[PDB]
Amino acid sequence: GDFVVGMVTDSGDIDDKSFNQQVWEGISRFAQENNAKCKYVTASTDAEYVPSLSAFADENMGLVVACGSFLVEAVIETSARFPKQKFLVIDAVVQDRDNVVSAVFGQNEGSFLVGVAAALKAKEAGKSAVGFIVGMELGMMPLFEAGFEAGVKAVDPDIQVVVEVANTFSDPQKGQALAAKLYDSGVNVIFQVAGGTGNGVIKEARDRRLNGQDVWVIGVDRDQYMDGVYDGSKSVVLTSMVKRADVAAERISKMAYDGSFPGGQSIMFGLEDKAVGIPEENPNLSSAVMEKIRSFEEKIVSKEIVVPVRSARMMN
Ligand SMILES: Nc1ncnc2c1ncn2[C@@H]1O[C@H](CO)[C@@H](O)[C@H]1O
Protein backbone atom coordinates (compact mmCIF):
# COMPACT_ATOMS: atom_id res chain seq x y z
CA GLY A 1 0.00 0.00 0.00
CA ASP A 2 0.93 3.64 -0.08
CA PHE A 3 -0.34 7.13 0.65
CA VAL A 4 -2.41 7.97 -2.44
CA VAL A 5 -3.64 11.31 -3.81
CA GLY A 6 -6.52 11.19 -6.27
CA MET A 7 -7.39 14.09 -8.55
CA VAL A 8 -10.74 14.74 -10.20
CA THR A 9 -10.95 17.27 -13.07
CA ASP A 10 -14.19 19.09 -13.87
CA SER A 11 -13.40 19.77 -17.52
CA GLY A 12 -10.71 18.87 -20.04
CA ASP A 13 -7.66 16.70 -19.33
CA ILE A 14 -4.27 16.86 -17.59
CA ASP A 15 -2.62 17.89 -20.86
CA ASP A 16 -4.43 21.26 -20.99
CA LYS A 17 -1.09 23.15 -21.04
CA SER A 18 -2.32 25.16 -18.11
CA PHE A 19 -4.58 24.59 -15.06
CA ASN A 20 -5.19 20.83 -14.88
CA GLN A 21 -1.59 20.35 -15.94
CA GLN A 22 -0.26 22.52 -13.13
CA VAL A 23 -2.35 20.69 -10.51
CA TRP A 24 -1.34 17.25 -11.80
CA GLU A 25 2.33 18.22 -11.96
CA GLY A 26 2.21 19.36 -8.33
CA ILE A 27 0.53 16.19 -7.07
CA SER A 28 3.02 14.22 -9.20
CA ARG A 29 6.08 15.96 -7.62
CA PHE A 30 4.67 15.36 -4.12
CA ALA A 31 4.28 11.66 -4.93
CA GLN A 32 7.67 11.25 -6.55
CA GLU A 33 9.49 13.07 -3.75
CA ASN A 34 7.74 11.13 -0.97
CA ASN A 35 7.46 7.63 -2.41
CA ALA A 36 3.69 8.05 -2.50
CA LYS A 37 1.26 7.46 -5.35
CA CYS A 38 -1.27 9.46 -7.28
CA LYS A 39 -3.96 9.04 -9.91
CA TYR A 40 -6.70 11.07 -11.56
CA VAL A 41 -10.02 10.71 -13.29
CA THR A 42 -11.63 13.13 -15.77
CA ALA A 43 -15.27 14.18 -15.33
CA SER A 44 -16.70 16.50 -18.00
CA THR A 45 -20.40 16.32 -17.01
CA ASP A 46 -21.50 17.27 -13.51
CA ALA A 47 -23.53 14.07 -13.04
CA GLU A 48 -20.10 12.46 -13.23
CA TYR A 49 -18.78 14.58 -10.34
CA VAL A 50 -20.22 13.00 -7.17
CA PRO A 51 -19.60 9.47 -8.50
CA SER A 52 -15.95 10.35 -9.21
CA LEU A 53 -15.24 11.94 -5.83
CA SER A 54 -17.13 9.18 -3.99
CA ALA A 55 -15.24 6.26 -5.56
CA PHE A 56 -11.97 7.91 -4.47
CA ALA A 57 -13.31 8.55 -0.96
CA ASP A 58 -14.44 4.90 -0.87
CA GLU A 59 -10.87 3.82 -1.57
CA ASN A 60 -9.87 5.65 1.64
CA MET A 61 -7.05 7.58 0.00
CA GLY A 62 -4.74 10.11 1.60
CA LEU A 63 -6.33 13.06 -0.15
CA VAL A 64 -8.95 13.69 -2.82
CA VAL A 65 -8.23 16.77 -4.95
CA ALA A 66 -11.16 18.50 -6.68
CA CYS A 67 -9.62 20.54 -9.49
CA GLY A 68 -11.85 23.46 -10.46
CA SER A 69 -14.86 25.47 -9.26
CA PHE A 70 -17.51 23.39 -11.07
CA LEU A 71 -16.88 20.77 -8.36
CA VAL A 72 -17.77 22.84 -5.29
CA GLU A 73 -21.31 21.49 -4.85
CA ALA A 74 -20.24 17.86 -5.38
CA VAL A 75 -17.47 18.35 -2.82
CA ILE A 76 -19.66 19.94 -0.18
CA GLU A 77 -22.11 17.02 -0.57
CA THR A 78 -19.50 14.26 -0.95
CA SER A 79 -17.39 15.44 1.95
CA ALA A 80 -20.55 15.41 4.05
CA ARG A 81 -21.01 11.71 3.47
CA PHE A 82 -17.33 10.87 3.91
CA PRO A 83 -16.21 12.78 7.05
CA LYS A 84 -13.09 10.67 7.56
CA GLN A 85 -11.78 11.45 4.04
CA LYS A 86 -9.65 14.57 3.45
CA PHE A 87 -10.52 16.75 0.45
CA LEU A 88 -8.72 19.66 -1.18
CA VAL A 89 -10.66 22.04 -3.43
CA ILE A 90 -8.56 24.05 -5.79
CA ASP A 91 -9.79 27.41 -7.07
CA ALA A 92 -12.91 27.89 -4.93
CA VAL A 93 -13.91 28.64 -1.34
CA VAL A 94 -15.21 25.95 1.01
CA GLN A 95 -15.37 26.66 4.72
CA ASP A 96 -16.90 25.07 7.80
CA ARG A 97 -15.81 21.58 6.85
CA ASP A 98 -13.15 19.92 8.96
CA ASN A 99 -12.23 17.47 6.20
CA VAL A 100 -12.03 20.10 3.44
CA VAL A 101 -9.25 22.57 2.68
CA SER A 102 -9.67 24.97 -0.20
CA ALA A 103 -6.97 26.86 -2.03
CA VAL A 104 -7.73 30.13 -3.82
CA PHE A 105 -5.37 32.57 -5.58
CA GLY A 106 -4.80 36.35 -5.66
CA GLN A 107 -5.10 36.29 -9.41
CA ASN A 108 -6.31 39.92 -9.49
CA GLU A 109 -2.88 40.94 -8.12
CA GLY A 110 -0.99 38.76 -10.58
CA SER A 111 -3.17 39.97 -13.45
CA PHE A 112 -2.42 43.58 -12.51
CA LEU A 113 1.18 42.87 -13.57
CA VAL A 114 0.38 41.54 -17.04
CA GLY A 115 -2.08 44.39 -17.54
CA VAL A 116 0.86 46.74 -17.08
CA ALA A 117 2.76 44.73 -19.71
CA ALA A 118 -0.27 44.73 -22.04
CA ALA A 119 -0.79 48.50 -21.83
CA LEU A 120 2.87 49.31 -22.45
CA LYS A 121 2.99 47.03 -25.49
CA ALA A 122 -0.31 48.48 -26.79
CA LYS A 123 0.95 52.07 -26.35
CA GLU A 124 3.97 51.13 -28.47
CA ALA A 125 1.64 50.64 -31.43
CA GLY A 126 -0.54 53.56 -30.50
CA LYS A 127 -3.41 51.25 -29.49
CA SER A 128 -6.08 52.34 -27.02
CA ALA A 129 -7.63 48.89 -26.61
CA VAL A 130 -6.46 45.46 -25.42
CA GLY A 131 -8.31 42.12 -25.51
CA PHE A 132 -9.28 39.68 -22.77
CA ILE A 133 -10.73 36.19 -23.32
CA VAL A 134 -11.92 34.33 -20.24
CA GLY A 135 -13.27 30.78 -20.07
CA MET A 136 -16.17 31.35 -17.62
CA GLU A 137 -17.10 34.10 -15.18
CA LEU A 138 -18.47 32.16 -12.25
CA GLY A 139 -16.74 31.76 -8.90
CA MET A 140 -13.45 33.64 -8.46
CA MET A 141 -12.97 34.00 -12.23
CA PRO A 142 -13.81 37.76 -12.28
CA LEU A 143 -10.64 38.50 -10.28
CA PHE A 144 -8.56 38.14 -13.49
CA GLU A 145 -10.39 40.86 -15.44
CA ALA A 146 -10.59 43.13 -12.35
CA GLY A 147 -6.82 42.98 -11.96
CA PHE A 148 -5.95 43.06 -15.67
CA GLU A 149 -8.04 46.23 -16.05
CA ALA A 150 -6.42 47.81 -12.95
CA GLY A 151 -2.92 47.18 -14.34
CA VAL A 152 -3.89 48.57 -17.78
CA LYS A 153 -5.34 51.74 -16.20
CA ALA A 154 -2.30 52.19 -13.95
CA VAL A 155 -0.38 52.72 -17.18
CA ASP A 156 -2.98 54.62 -19.20
CA PRO A 157 -6.62 55.20 -18.12
CA ASP A 158 -7.68 55.78 -21.72
CA ILE A 159 -6.91 52.21 -22.81
CA GLN A 160 -10.06 50.07 -22.96
CA VAL A 161 -10.26 46.33 -22.19
CA VAL A 162 -12.44 44.39 -24.68
CA VAL A 163 -13.81 41.21 -23.11
CA GLU A 164 -15.04 37.93 -24.66
CA VAL A 165 -16.29 35.02 -22.54
CA ALA A 166 -15.94 31.56 -24.08
CA ASN A 167 -18.32 29.82 -21.65
CA THR A 168 -16.01 26.78 -21.65
CA PHE A 169 -12.48 25.89 -20.57
CA SER A 170 -12.19 23.02 -23.03
CA ASP A 171 -12.93 24.29 -26.56
CA PRO A 172 -9.78 25.57 -28.37
CA GLN A 173 -11.86 25.89 -31.54
CA LYS A 174 -13.93 28.56 -29.73
CA GLY A 175 -10.77 30.13 -28.25
CA GLN A 176 -9.35 30.53 -31.75
CA ALA A 177 -12.65 31.97 -33.02
CA LEU A 178 -12.85 34.53 -30.19
CA ALA A 179 -9.22 35.48 -30.69
CA ALA A 180 -9.78 36.05 -34.42
CA LYS A 181 -12.76 38.24 -33.57
CA LEU A 182 -10.67 40.37 -31.22
CA TYR A 183 -7.61 40.63 -33.47
CA ASP A 184 -9.85 41.38 -36.51
CA SER A 185 -11.13 44.41 -34.52
CA GLY A 186 -7.62 45.94 -34.36
CA VAL A 187 -6.49 44.74 -30.92
CA ASN A 188 -2.77 43.77 -30.84
CA VAL A 189 -2.65 42.18 -27.39
CA ILE A 190 -4.96 39.59 -25.82
CA PHE A 191 -4.74 38.22 -22.25
CA GLN A 192 -6.18 34.67 -22.33
CA VAL A 193 -7.56 33.16 -19.08
CA ALA A 194 -9.25 30.16 -20.56
CA GLY A 195 -7.45 26.90 -19.79
CA GLY A 196 -7.62 24.41 -22.68
CA THR A 197 -9.76 26.85 -24.67
CA GLY A 198 -6.84 29.27 -24.31
CA ASN A 199 -4.61 27.04 -26.38
CA GLY A 200 -6.72 27.99 -29.39
CA VAL A 201 -6.14 31.67 -28.58
CA ILE A 202 -2.35 31.12 -28.54
CA LYS A 203 -2.64 29.21 -31.83
CA GLU A 204 -4.51 32.11 -33.48
CA ALA A 205 -1.82 34.55 -32.30
CA ARG A 206 0.91 32.33 -33.85
CA ASP A 207 -1.08 32.00 -37.11
CA ARG A 208 -1.60 35.79 -37.18
CA ARG A 209 2.05 36.67 -36.70
CA LEU A 210 3.11 34.24 -39.42
CA ASN A 211 0.47 36.01 -41.54
CA GLY A 212 2.23 39.35 -41.04
CA GLN A 213 0.15 40.82 -38.20
CA ASP A 214 2.12 42.16 -35.21
CA VAL A 215 -0.03 40.57 -32.51
CA TRP A 216 0.63 39.24 -29.03
CA VAL A 217 -0.97 36.96 -26.45
CA ILE A 218 -0.41 36.79 -22.66
CA GLY A 219 -0.56 33.27 -21.25
CA VAL A 220 -1.85 31.95 -17.96
CA ASP A 221 -1.27 29.28 -15.26
CA ARG A 222 2.02 28.09 -16.74
CA ASP A 223 4.88 30.11 -18.22
CA GLN A 224 3.52 29.64 -21.75
CA TYR A 225 6.36 31.37 -23.59
CA MET A 226 7.47 28.29 -25.57
CA ASP A 227 3.88 27.41 -26.60
CA GLY A 228 3.92 30.64 -28.59
CA VAL A 229 7.01 30.06 -30.73
CA TYR A 230 6.01 30.63 -34.36
CA ASP A 231 9.12 30.90 -36.59
CA GLY A 232 11.58 28.70 -34.81
CA SER A 233 12.93 31.43 -32.52
CA LYS A 234 10.53 34.24 -31.65
CA SER A 235 7.31 33.85 -29.64
CA VAL A 236 3.94 35.63 -29.70
CA VAL A 237 3.61 35.25 -25.90
CA LEU A 238 4.34 38.68 -24.39
CA THR A 239 4.48 37.14 -20.90
CA SER A 240 2.21 34.92 -18.76
CA MET A 241 0.19 35.31 -15.56
CA VAL A 242 1.68 32.32 -13.77
CA LYS A 243 -0.50 30.69 -11.08
CA ARG A 244 1.20 28.08 -8.89
CA ALA A 245 -1.69 25.68 -8.51
CA ASP A 246 1.07 23.03 -8.64
CA VAL A 247 2.73 24.38 -5.45
CA ALA A 248 -0.64 24.59 -3.70
CA ALA A 249 -1.43 20.96 -4.59
CA GLU A 250 2.04 19.77 -3.69
CA ARG A 251 2.13 21.62 -0.36
CA ILE A 252 -1.32 20.64 0.90
CA SER A 253 -0.78 16.98 -0.20
CA LYS A 254 2.44 17.01 1.89
CA MET A 255 0.56 18.48 4.88
CA ALA A 256 -2.07 15.77 4.63
CA TYR A 257 0.70 13.17 4.32
CA ASP A 258 2.40 14.59 7.45
CA GLY A 259 -0.64 14.87 9.68
CA SER A 260 -0.94 18.68 9.54
CA PHE A 261 -3.93 19.00 7.15
CA PRO A 262 -5.57 22.44 7.80
CA GLY A 263 -9.18 21.27 7.51
CA GLY A 264 -11.94 23.89 7.47
CA GLN A 265 -9.59 26.54 6.07
CA SER A 266 -9.72 28.33 2.71
CA ILE A 267 -6.06 29.33 2.08
CA MET A 268 -5.03 32.27 -0.13
CA PHE A 269 -1.91 31.92 -2.32
CA GLY A 270 -0.91 35.41 -3.41
CA LEU A 271 1.65 37.67 -5.05
CA GLU A 272 3.56 38.02 -1.80
CA ASP A 273 3.95 34.22 -1.67
CA LYS A 274 4.96 34.33 -5.36
CA ALA A 275 2.03 31.97 -6.06
CA VAL A 276 0.93 34.33 -8.88
CA GLY A 277 2.80 36.87 -10.99
CA ILE A 278 5.00 36.65 -14.08
CA PRO A 279 7.87 34.30 -14.99
CA GLU A 280 11.37 34.91 -13.58
CA GLU A 281 12.68 35.57 -17.14
CA ASN A 282 10.71 37.35 -19.89
CA PRO A 283 12.44 37.51 -23.31
CA ASN A 284 9.65 39.64 -24.81
CA LEU A 285 9.71 42.27 -22.03
CA SER A 286 12.35 45.03 -21.99
CA SER A 287 14.27 45.95 -18.83
CA ALA A 288 12.35 49.23 -18.64
CA VAL A 289 9.06 47.34 -18.70
CA MET A 290 10.30 44.83 -16.14
CA GLU A 291 11.36 47.79 -13.96
CA LYS A 292 7.86 49.28 -13.99
CA ILE A 293 6.27 45.91 -13.29
CA ARG A 294 8.49 45.12 -10.32
CA SER A 295 7.77 48.60 -8.93
CA PHE A 296 4.02 47.96 -9.05
CA GLU A 297 4.56 44.47 -7.70
CA GLU A 298 6.34 45.80 -4.60
CA LYS A 299 3.55 48.32 -3.98
CA ILE A 300 0.83 45.69 -4.21
CA VAL A 301 2.75 43.35 -1.86
CA SER A 302 3.26 46.17 0.67
CA LYS A 303 -0.45 47.03 0.34
CA GLU A 304 0.43 50.58 -0.81
CA ILE A 305 -1.85 49.70 -3.73
CA VAL A 306 -4.95 47.55 -3.28
CA VAL A 307 -6.06 45.75 -6.44
CA PRO A 308 -9.84 45.54 -6.93
CA VAL A 309 -11.70 42.23 -6.98
CA ARG A 310 -14.26 43.36 -9.57
CA SER A 311 -13.75 45.46 -12.72
CA ALA A 312 -15.40 48.85 -13.27
CA ARG A 313 -18.13 47.39 -15.50
CA MET A 314 -18.98 44.86 -12.74
CA MET A 315 -19.11 47.38 -9.88
CA ASN A 316 -22.13 49.35 -8.68
N1 LIG B 1 -10.72 22.78 -16.48
C1 LIG B 1 -11.00 23.88 -15.69
N2 LIG B 1 -11.96 23.85 -14.74
C2 LIG B 1 -12.15 24.89 -13.88
N3 LIG B 1 -11.45 26.00 -13.97
C3 LIG B 1 -10.51 26.14 -14.95
C4 LIG B 1 -10.26 25.07 -15.85
N4 LIG B 1 -9.30 25.47 -16.72
C5 LIG B 1 -8.96 26.69 -16.43
N5 LIG B 1 -9.67 27.15 -15.33
C6 LIG B 1 -9.62 28.50 -14.72
O1 LIG B 1 -9.19 29.50 -15.70
C7 LIG B 1 -7.85 29.98 -15.31
C8 LIG B 1 -6.94 30.15 -16.53
O2 LIG B 1 -6.86 28.92 -17.24
C9 LIG B 1 -7.30 28.94 -14.29
O3 LIG B 1 -6.28 29.49 -13.42
C10 LIG B 1 -8.61 28.54 -13.57
O4 LIG B 1 -8.97 29.55 -12.60
Side-chain angles (χ1 to χ4, degrees):
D2 208 333
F3 178 91
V4 182
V5 176
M7 177 182 93
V8 178
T9 59
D10 66 12
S11 185
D13 206 345
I14 64 168
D15 61 328
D16 71 353
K17 307 297 184 291
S18 51
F19 187 61
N20 293 336
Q21 189 166 312
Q22 279 285 54
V23 177
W24 180 241
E25 289 189 6
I27 293 169
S28 293
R29 282 200 301 276
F30 157 75
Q32 174 58 51
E33 308 177 330
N34 298 100
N35 291 84
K37 297 192 188 67
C38 58
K39 61 180 178 182
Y40 68 97
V41 293
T42 60
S44 57
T45 60
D46 64 4
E48 263 185 316
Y49 295 165
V50 174
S52 295
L53 298 169
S54 297
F56 280 178
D58 278 328
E59 293 164 14
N60 298 298
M61 33 184 78
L63 178 70
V64 173
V65 182
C67 182
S69 67
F70 302 157
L71 284 164
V72 179
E73 288 217 307
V75 162
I76 282 182
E77 183 269 13
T78 293
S79 59
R81 290 157 56 193
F82 300 98
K84 298 307 194 292
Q85 171 68 70
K86 300 176 197 54
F87 294 85
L88 158 64
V89 180
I90 294 172
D91 218 45
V93 185
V94 173
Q95 285 169 46
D96 288 61
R97 296 187 123 61
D98 303 322
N99 61 333
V100 173
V101 164
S102 44
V104 298
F105 304 74
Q107 56 220 11
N108 52 326
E109 304 185 318
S111 293
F112 185 111
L113 305 194
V114 306
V116 169
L120 295 170
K121 171 61 56 186
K123 259 183 161 296
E124 252 185 277
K127 302 293 196 175
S128 46
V130 295
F132 179 76
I133 292 173
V134 59
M136 302 279 283
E137 292 194 302
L138 66 189
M140 317 279 277
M141 293 306 300
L143 289 175
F144 288 97
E145 184 194 325
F148 182 57
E149 176 183 67
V152 167
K153 298 311 175 75
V155 168
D156 184 347
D158 299 311
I159 293 176
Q160 302 303 299
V161 176
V162 187
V163 178
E164 292 292 342
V165 179
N167 197 37
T168 174
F169 288 115
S170 306
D171 189 349
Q173 184 185 76
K174 181 69 167 294
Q176 176 139 37
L178 295 173
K181 184 186 177 189
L182 273 171
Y183 290 136
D184 283 349
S185 77
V187 159
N188 83 321
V189 178
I190 299 182
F191 176 26
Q192 75 90 351
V193 183
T197 296
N199 298 323
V201 174
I202 291 171
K203 184 186 175 293
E204 174 63 17
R206 294 198 310 270
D207 294 349
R208 293 252 164 179
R209 191 73 78 77
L210 194 70
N211 291 193
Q213 289 173 52
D214 173 42
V215 302
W216 302 85
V217 64
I218 292 172
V220 73
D221 296 316
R222 278 181 49 253
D223 170 349
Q224 300 187 307
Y225 188 87
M226 289 308 295
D227 312 29
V229 177
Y230 68 89
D231 65 8
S233 326
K234 300 196 297 175
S235 175
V236 300
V237 175
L238 181 59
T239 184
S240 298
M241 205 306 278
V242 175
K243 177 170 155 181
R244 310 305 301 275
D246 59 318
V247 175
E250 170 167 39
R251 280 181 39 192
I252 295 163
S253 288
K254 182 65 161 52
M255 292 182 89
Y257 176 70
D258 290 340
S260 61
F261 189 67
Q265 299 187 50
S266 59
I267 302 75
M268 167 63 77
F269 293 76
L271 189 58
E272 181 156 35
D273 293 337
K274 286 67 156 52
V276 297
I278 62 176
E280 181 181 8
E281 297 298 321
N282 295 279
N284 284 147
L285 299 181
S286 66
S287 287
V289 168
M290 285 303 286
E291 207 78 350
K292 297 186 173 174
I293 294 180
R294 299 304 189 189
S295 178
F296 281 116
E297 175 169 36
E298 176 193 66
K299 288 177 181 52
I300 295 170
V301 162
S302 74
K303 306 170 173 185
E304 174 182 316
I305 283 171
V306 289
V307 183
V309 293
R310 285 300 179 277
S311 65
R313 79 191 179 91
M314 296 187 182
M315 283 181 148
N316 304 329

